[PDB]
């Protein structure tokens, strides 16, 4: 079999996408809060994640179809699902080698401990690894990568998600782009499609042990005050 | 709500 | 003339408070997001002013008799005057000979420049600049540099407050032990209480452009996600 | 609302 012409342009549009919002020589990093190693990681690590959200609202945008969704709708799919996109998309900088991320150069490499530091326990950085290691060991195309981060944006199963019928026959698209592309262009991959489907159910597992501790984070003042603005939107429970 | 999200939203 | 017992007990209090929340090492400032010279200063703007409340709400906290306020009080009287102790305790760090405020380290010197680029402007910067020049080179003992602060911190003529009485009859006796120690400590300052109260006004109308200019950054909200949540709480509109 | 306002004078 082939991928179609529209299947195509969906793939190109999505890797263009994805190089405009993920700059691989991390030099924006120097102007976060500098890391420190009660919660000494806590203002580094939120300014990593606060500039990570506006990379991934960036990344929805050029999503064919996200833009005329209703605003409403924008912002549910971002809300929910913004974090689970952060996990995908840092198993870019995770390294098998080092079970860190490494963000060009040893000030932005990050290990559990430093996650740790930013008020985070092993219920969620030990599934959190294991989940990196394995999505690691698949060995994604980038064309792969960028179709899985888009299809875990375009879930229409959501918390406050109305155009229901329109997400889903999105998401359903660009499924079928995925499952094309593996069976076409990626060598022994019969099983590879049901693995990543896997890391979908993963990843709302990583979503609620976060956003359990998370919500104790930003029970504490002296800890809430610590995050940017845009996390505490992005991250809170505003409807 | 979601001014800073609207916002990036464009 | 001599001063009292009470009023030896006040001032040791205030010099206390005081060098207990300014540190005049500045090695804090390494924390923050790091200067750039559209509002390239900002970020590093915005966590040196965040930093500065929580140290002039350590500050107020050992004001004798502030603590034993309303909480509603305290807000009240921190949301407005803020500001003014920000620029009253800057003068610290401002250099007569340099124009700018010098906070050890040539990173961590501000210009008039740098702080244009965090979103102000000459109507807010000229007679900020001028204020610092005259305040300077009224050459005040520390004991009357805090003293002001706290006279300052504690007016009740400002939005929100209730308890009126009581928070004028603790600013009145801070103005008594002022006048005091002038006449007794500070020798040829006959008209030194009064430049200092008419700097008390000064402040009230760089007050008021600071707000102006402020309002125009909170509602923009790809300057105001730069801004910490306590500039926004604190500088913010909510009663 | 000031929710840090309030945990900062403790
Ligand atoms: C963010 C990215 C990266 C790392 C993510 C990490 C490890 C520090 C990471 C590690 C653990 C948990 C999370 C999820 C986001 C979080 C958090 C912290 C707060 C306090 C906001 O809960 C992320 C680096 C790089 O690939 C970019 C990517 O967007
Ligand atoms: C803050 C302190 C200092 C400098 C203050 C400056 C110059 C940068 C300054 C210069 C201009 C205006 C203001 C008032 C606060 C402000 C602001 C920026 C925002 C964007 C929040 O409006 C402060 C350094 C040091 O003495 C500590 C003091 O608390």
């Not at chain 1, 990196?132 to 299809?151: S, Y």
């Given at each position: 079999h082939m991928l179609s012409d529209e299947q195509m342009q969906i793939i190109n549009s999505l890797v263009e996408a994805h190089h405009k919002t993920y700059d691989d020589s991390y030099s924006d990093f120097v102007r976060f809060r500098?890391?420190?190693?009660?919660?000494?990681?806590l203002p580094h690590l939120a300014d990593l994640v606060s500039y990570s959200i506006q990379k991934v609202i960036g990344f929805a945008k050029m999503?064919?179809?996200?833009?005329?969704?209703?605003?409403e709708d924008q912002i549910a799919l971002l809300k929910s699902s913004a974090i689970e996109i952060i996990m995908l998309r840092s198993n870019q900088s995770f390294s098998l080698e080092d079970m860190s991320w490494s963000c060009g150069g040893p000030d932005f490499k990050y290990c559990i401990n430093d996650?740790?530091?930013?008020?985070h326990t092993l219920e969620l950085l030990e599934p959190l690894v294991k989940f990196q290691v394995g999505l690691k060991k698949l060995k994604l195309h980038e064309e792969e990568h960028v179709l899985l981060m888009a299809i875990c944006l375009l879930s229409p199963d959501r918390p406050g998600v109305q155009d229901h019928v329109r997400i889903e026959a999105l998401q359903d698209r660009l499924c079928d782009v995925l499952q094309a592309?593996?069976?076409?262009?990626?060598?022994?991959?019969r099983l590879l499609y049901a693995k990543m489907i896997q890391k979908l159910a993963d990843?709302?597992?990583?979503?609620?042990?976060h956003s359990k501790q998370y919500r104790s984070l930003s029970f504490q003042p002296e800890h809430s005050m610590?995050?940017?603005?845009?996390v505490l939107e992005v991250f809170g429970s505003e409807v | 709500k979601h001014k800073i999200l609207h916002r990036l939203l464009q």
């Amino acid at each position: 079999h082939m991928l179609s012409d529209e299947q195509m342009q969906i793939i190109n549009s999505l890797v263009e996408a994805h190089h405009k919002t993920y700059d691989d020589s991390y030099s924006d990093f120097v102007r976060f809060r500098p890391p420190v190693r009660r919660l000494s990681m806590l203002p580094h690590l939120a300014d990593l994640v606060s500039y990570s959200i506006q990379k991934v609202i960036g990344f929805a945008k050029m999503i064919p179809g996200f833009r005329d969704l209703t605003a409403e709708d924008q912002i549910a799919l971002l809300k929910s699902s913004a974090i689970e996109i952060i996990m995908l998309r840092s198993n870019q900088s995770f390294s098998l080698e080092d079970m860190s991320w490494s963000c060009g150069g040893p000030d932005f490499k990050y290990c559990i401990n430093d996650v740790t530091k930013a008020g985070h326990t092993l219920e969620l950085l030990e599934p959190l690894v294991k989940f990196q290691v394995g999505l690691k060991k698949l060995k994604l195309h980038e064309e792969e990568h960028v179709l899985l981060m888009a299809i875990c944006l375009l879930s229409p199963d959501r918390p406050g998600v109305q155009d229901h019928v329109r997400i889903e026959a999105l998401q359903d698209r660009l499924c079928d782009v995925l499952q094309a592309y593996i069976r076409i262009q990626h060598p022994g991959g019969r099983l590879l499609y049901a693995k990543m489907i896997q890391k979908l159910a993963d990843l709302r597992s990583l979503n609620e042990e976060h956003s359990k501790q998370y919500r104790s984070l930003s029970f504490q003042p002296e800890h809430s005050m610590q995050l940017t603005p845009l996390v505490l939107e992005v991250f809170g429970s505003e409807v | 709500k979601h001014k800073i999200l609207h916002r990036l939203l464009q």
